[PDB]
Amino acid sequence: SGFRKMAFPSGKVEGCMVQVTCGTTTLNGLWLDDVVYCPRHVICTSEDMLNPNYEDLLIRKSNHNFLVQAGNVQLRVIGHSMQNCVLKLKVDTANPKTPKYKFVRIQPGQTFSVLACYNGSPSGVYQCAMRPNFTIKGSFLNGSCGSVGFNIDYDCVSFCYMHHMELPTGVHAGTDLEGNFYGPFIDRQTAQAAGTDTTITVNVLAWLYAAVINGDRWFLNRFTTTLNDFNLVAMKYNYEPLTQDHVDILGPLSAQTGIAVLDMCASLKELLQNGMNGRTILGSALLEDEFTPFDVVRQCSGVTFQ
């Protein structure tokens, strides 16, 4: 029993973290085979942050201008190139701890683990979601850029995020591992800000099912609703629309508990219209939307990774 915000084991990713230094700036890079991937803004200086001309800054740097360290060992850079908002530093040594891996671009509403790193060394791991507004609610300080997010399936690490920027509310923006930003954001010090976020409805439902599996059932009512009527209430409270694909994705949790998704929706509608009145669900006084259905099943069935 119990339910925690659970991260993936980080070991496969830890063996890939290195330090990249270019002049003043040090941040983190990801060493896979003989390539280190890092944020291109490692080549910037404090002045040229308003509008960096990345091609112009880069043509002034040669291989030796990138200092790349894997713990105590220096990795010699023998090539470099820019792809979108990342640098690929070809090094003379293939990483012997490269895991089986894929680069994936995740969808809003999906979750992943972040291995927060400073100077190439890991600080901690936590779980996050790609918000509908293409930000993530992370925990990141100066020097954290190049830290990655990832999922593990079986034996394969799927890298989906690299950290670049912090936006005004203290939320975070970054790229996939091809260097394309999630959302409208760019690596410039400008006025950009996050769009208005929404609450990931299918995930809230998943978490209500998680509550039920753990014996926390007080919020279940005797009513049902239609999908259309549910979605009218959801819009009012700034919840995403629930689609039939969402309903079907929730099928396994509905089956385990014997609670039809639309019945669960009627209970969610009541929680949104009436509040929780001092009560908690899985130790929380708010509805939680950063567990996906798959996350709930993994945790409540004991799924492991090779």
Next chain:
Amino acid sequence: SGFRKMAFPSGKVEGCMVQVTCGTTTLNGLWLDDVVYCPRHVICTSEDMLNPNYEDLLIRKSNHNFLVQAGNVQLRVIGHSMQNCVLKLKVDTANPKTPKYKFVRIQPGQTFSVLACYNGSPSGVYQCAMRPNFTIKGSFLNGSCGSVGFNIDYDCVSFCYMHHMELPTGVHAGTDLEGNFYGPFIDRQTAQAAGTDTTITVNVLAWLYAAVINGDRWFLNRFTTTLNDFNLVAMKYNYEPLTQDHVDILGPLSAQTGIAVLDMCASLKELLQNGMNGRTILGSALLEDEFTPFDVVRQCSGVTFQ
């Protein structure tokens, strides 16, 4: 910016997890040098759970009756012995990924990371606290026993918990790595239940400081209090007494923010007497007590591990 329930990188511990099978039961063990440590109840059967006679069950088992698997490779057991509530299985191979490590018995109020495992393979990592009532609010299913909790300092893994039991409210009980239970609990299927818990006050204060560092300041009032007056309010709301040692442990966070601990206490007293009135602190509608001062400083300063 930002603040998350952050776990330690798990890689050093992942390389120590193995599977132990004895007849019907499979659970997890911790492979350090040429010793595998696991819960002694691996030698039990479904009937003899009310009152196992562990010495009698064990004398009927020889080395070959313990099947120990490190991923795909079988580890031959060449000795076995019982220490308190754990078995130590001497194996013919020293683990080549043994990290620098220590066995520590933590204090109530302290936090650690759990690497939840099934069949020797990791499922996820999350952060927990040793509750004042010597339980932990974990997430554990059948087969999770032998999963460990730990802290990382510099390059040294300090193992502090191994998982054995689930108590009636869905909370968890286990031992240190010498096989002594935390709390009054034992490895028997009996009526045992957890004492009444309390809220870890110094930790709540640490987390309020974490809020302030991140710009979430609305709960700070203009008042102060004495330590004795604060502790009268704390008792009423089932909070532990705050000691002068606690006050001094909070010194670094008080210094960074410029908020005297007793001033912060006056703000906490107001939150306990008046509630939050629909507001949140660091995204939470409840006060959080599973961050220690040290956890807050690590996260808000970027501490890394070798």
